[PDB]
Design a protein around this ligand. Structure first.
Ligand SMILES: NC(=O)c1ccc[n+]([C@@H]2O[C@H](COP(=O)([O-])OP(=O)(O)OC[C@H]3O[C@@H](n4cnc5c(N)ncnc54)[C@H](O)[C@@H]3O)[C@@H](O)[C@H]2O)c1
Ligand SMILES: NC(=O)c1ccc[n+]([C@@H]2O[C@H](COP(=O)([O-])OP(=O)(O)OC[C@H]3O[C@@H](n4cnc5c(N)ncnc54)[C@H](O)[C@@H]3O)[C@@H](O)[C@H]2O)c1
Ligand SMILES: O=C(O)[C@H]1O[C@H](OP(=O)(O)OP(=O)(O)OC[C@H]2O[C@@H](n3ccc(=O)[nH]c3=O)[C@H](O)[C@@H]2O)[C@H](O)[C@@H](O)[C@@H]1O
Ligand SMILES: O=C(O)[C@H]1O[C@H](OP(=O)(O)OP(=O)(O)OC[C@H]2O[C@@H](n3ccc(=O)[nH]c3=O)[C@H](O)[C@@H]2O)[C@H](O)[C@@H](O)[C@@H]1O
Lengths: 375, 367
């Protein structure tokens, strides 16, 4: 039964990038908590093998992998035509190669999505596009003098979806390649919703954290790979190295437990009366920390989870030239405004930062420790 | 002879959107002041008809025309002006705007990089969008620090409205194309230069509605106010015309572009603000100043109230938002090409409105 009060008609859902971090967890909540049928499209299925017929036949029927690459594969339009609802996760989304493979980044996050949008509008299918909190980029507050009082006015850091600006660095700062592409795709989807009648919903994850995020370098992922902080630190703690802090890890972020976030997405799927039209911050404003804090807190939790204790210095500073490369720039403070999502879907994040790290690092320890020993 | 000191080897130049406002004036400076050969590509040639009986029109639409890649290969240097650039239909045809300013340019960029041709892409000062200063409280002292309103090309941010503010459709597309061109210059070896016009003003800009274009069309402020003065109506000021802009005489600007063409040792790599920081006014001021000049130029005098306020809902439509203050920086351009705008605002309006009066007045009477 939906929020409006109506009963929930089941759906065939075309999920693109469904073998990803967010994809995989979504498949789980859909299978376990709902009637819906999933078409899982991705180039890899590693993270959903545990749910495919070969590894199990408990969900034979209601999920179907299709190894497709949407860059060029005729098969796609038909697969879309096959479903009632398309969810597009398929994207390069590691900051690491926004300034290093800027063309592939732009093509990934803008160009390769356009077809998906063509087909949804043509065939009158509903679209859920996954954008990012990086679309807001920098916080107006960030340009005020150090410790200027205006920084304390929420006016200057809260990121409201209907009115806060999209602020990026100059062109030479190639990290914004990703954000600018995401901005344009949102603008296009919104328009297509306006010029044409596209039913759509756009999701801006603020730093979703849980298992399967990215990869541990050398194990599941590569050796010279560079993921996103959770994965990065995770590796540091497992390998018993210190945690590399980029320019002293003074940026801030707000982390939300992946489970909390998936509930949000579900509410959107099942209440199109209230999600069609809108853009949604999915984040947990209460779990804010600096990156240095995330690191400290993660070492503490990890010691709890591991048994094994501290490290001499558990962190170290490193220049962004050294770490990220040439044209790095950074989002300074993500704090989601929860008026729109709260009003439309009644959503709120239940889970604490400490709690979600206890959860996530136990998954990390139980998965990667016998492995990282044999290496 | 170039700035570096070298002599200038002549060039075949592929100019796309060459029958446009900027296109047309460029063809003139190339023909009259230089050795270069021009390939003029456009769907329309109306504004180059006068100089058409070293220049070769090709009625080509770049959206889909095989002919293009060969035309590009035909030249040494490509200049891409071809773009929807009227604020009017950024919030009203957002798809066509985005496709125009991002997607349709991509092929041009494919061919230039593939075939090792030099590219000059015309972007815009909108790419900066809003000034950081715009978010400080009314009359907050920090607004006076140039830190908060000058738009430096290598470091100032691109600040746009939320998504629902569809005017930024245009700016975001232009931003991404710049980012891609710059990326292609980095990942691949593309020789390129990007131009950010700040409000270039002069002769064949846009159209007069009902004479040079659609009766219900809506161009840029020069053309809009030009029509108001010619038709003897008041000048419609959008939300009291309190935004500011800096206008540069079209002739001054074209000199800049030429310097870039003829001095690749200094222009390859860079992004350039072409504007004239000294000619800043609010829109209300531009209107006042234009009515004054026009009275001078026309003979005919004032109007009772010569302006009137109008809501942007009423004027521009649904998702309008606005660049608040353009004031270009010039350190880069000035350092690379030695360029500076000679011409005054009043002077350039005396010039432009005399062209307007001599062109549109017998016409507007007969209507
Ligand atoms: C935000 O949140 C969204 C999802 O984040 P996430 O943490 O699940 O990322 P993720 O990378 O873990 O999930 C995305 C999935 O999309 C897939 N993908 C990328 N390009 C593809 C293509 N051409 N064809 C098929 N699959 C492709 C990837 O292989 C990956 O499995 C992203 O769109 C991001 O931009
Ligand atoms: C800034 O400065 C630049 C030029 O400004 P302007 O005032 O000269 O504009 P303008 O329109 O006066 O000049 C651009 C020209 O490009 C042409 N054009 C647009 N789409 C085309 C296509 N598919 N094929 C061929 N020609 C096409 C138009 O017909 C127009 O003549 C723009 O890029 C703008 O974004
Ligand atoms: O998960 C998200 O919601 C967002 O995460 C990333 O953006 P970001 O958070 O800036 O980048 P991360 O690499 O996760 O790290 C956060 C910040 O911590 C720092 N960091 C990261 C990694 C590390 O090992 N050390 C470190 O100090 C950097 O400032 C980095 O920008 C993606 O760019 C967005 O697409 C995505 O929506
Ligand atoms: O000339 C430029 O360099 C830029 O001009 C336009 O941007 P913009 O200046 O915002 O818009 P205009 O319609 O030219 O008018 C400027 C402002 O004057 C006001 N206006 C305009 C017209 C009118 O009749 N009345 C009026 O009050 C509005 O604030 C309007 O945005 C384009 O957005 C840019 O592509 C271009 O590079």
């Amino acid at each position: 039964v939906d929020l409006d009060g109506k009963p929930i008609q089941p759906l065939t859902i075309c999920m693109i990038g469904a073998g990803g971090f967010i994809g995989s967890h979504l498949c789980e909540k859909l299978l376990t908590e709902t009637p819906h049928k999933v078409l899982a499209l991705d180039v890899y299925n590693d993270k959903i093998k545990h749910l495919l017929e070969p590894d199990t036949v408990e969900w034979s029927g209601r999920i179907q992998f299709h190894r497709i690459n949407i860059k060029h594969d005729s098969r796609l339009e038909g697969l879309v035509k096959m479903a009632d609802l398309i969810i597009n996760l398929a994207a390069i989304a590691t900051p690491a190669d926004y300034n290093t493979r800027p063309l592939d980044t732009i093509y990934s996050n803008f160009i390769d999505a356009l077809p998906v949008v063509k087909y949804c509008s043509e065939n009158n299918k509903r679209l859920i596009h996954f954008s990012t909190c990086e679309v807001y980029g920098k916080t107006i507050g960030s340009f005020l003098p150090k410790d200027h009082p205006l920084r304390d006015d929420p006016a200057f850091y809260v990121l409201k979806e209907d009115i806060s600006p999209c602020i990026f660095g100059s062109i030479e700062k190639q990290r914004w390649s990703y954000a600018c592409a995401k901005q344009l795709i949102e603008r296009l989807v919104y328009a297509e919703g306006a010029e044409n009648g596209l039913e759509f919903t756009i999701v801006r994850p603020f730093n979703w954290i849980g298992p399967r995020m990215d990869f541990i370098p050398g194990i599941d992922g590569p050796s010279e790979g560079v993921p996103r902080v959770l994965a990065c630190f995770s590796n540091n703690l497992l390998r018993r190295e210190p945690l590399k802090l980029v320019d002293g890890g003074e940026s801030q972020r707000t982390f939300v437990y992946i489970n909390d976030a998936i509930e949000a997405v579900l509410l959107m799927i099942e209440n199109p009366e209230r999600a069609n039209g809108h853009i949604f911050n999915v984040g947990n404003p209460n779990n804010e920390v600096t990156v240095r804090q995330l690191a400290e807190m993660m070492t503490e939790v990890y010691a709890k989870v591991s048994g094994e204790g501290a490290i001499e210095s558990p962190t170290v500073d490193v220049s962004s030239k050294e770490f990220y490369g040439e044209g790095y720039d950074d989002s300074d403070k993500r704090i989601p405004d929860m008026t729109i999502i709260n009003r439309q879907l009644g959503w709120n994040p239940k889970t604490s930062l400490w709690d979600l790290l206890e959860s996530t690092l136990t998954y990390q320890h139980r998965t990667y420790a016998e492995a990282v020993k044999k290496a």
